[PDB]
Amino acid sequence: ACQYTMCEYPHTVCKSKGSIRNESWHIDSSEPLCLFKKNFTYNVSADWLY
């Protein structure tokens, strides 16, 4: 949860087979004010995620 300089046409790109484009949803190389930051781990062999 941050103050993200979000782009106009945001999208992502899978990192097993790289696409033509690149991940461009923010150009924010300024480390902006973040009210929250965290990382969690889940199952890679799971069917669904709720």
Binding site: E31, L33, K37
Partner: protein, 99 residues
């Protein structure tokens, strides 16, 4: 007063001290994992890192690196321990002895 049975509030307990627990949102900056780095730069090409959006204190810092002095300026040394700044920018280099 008359004869009778009366109910009187006698003070019995009072809270001694408090317990405080809170889960942190942001992470530890680990300044001392940078100040104890091996490759120390010389006063021509000093480094700088910008520790921002994390949590820190001072006591584990200044006992985990072998301090010889800690002055301050435009500040009071106990005003660190409370407040919440916006970033910290540590710039280190080695010292030539006669200068």
């Amino acid at each position: 007063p008359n004869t009778g049975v009366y109910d009187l509030s006698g003070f019995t307990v009072k809270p001694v001290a408090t317990v405080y627990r809170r889960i942190p949102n942001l992470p530890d900056c680990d300044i001392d994992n940078w100040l104890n780095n091996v490759s120390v730069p010389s006063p021509l090409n000093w480094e700088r890192r910008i520790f921002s959006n994390c949590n820190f204190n001072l006591s584990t810092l200044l006992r985990l690196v072998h301090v010889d002095s800690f002055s301050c300026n435009n500040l009071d040394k106990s005003k660190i321990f409370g407040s919440c700044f916006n970033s910290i920018t540590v710039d280190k280099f080695a010292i030539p002895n006669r200068r």
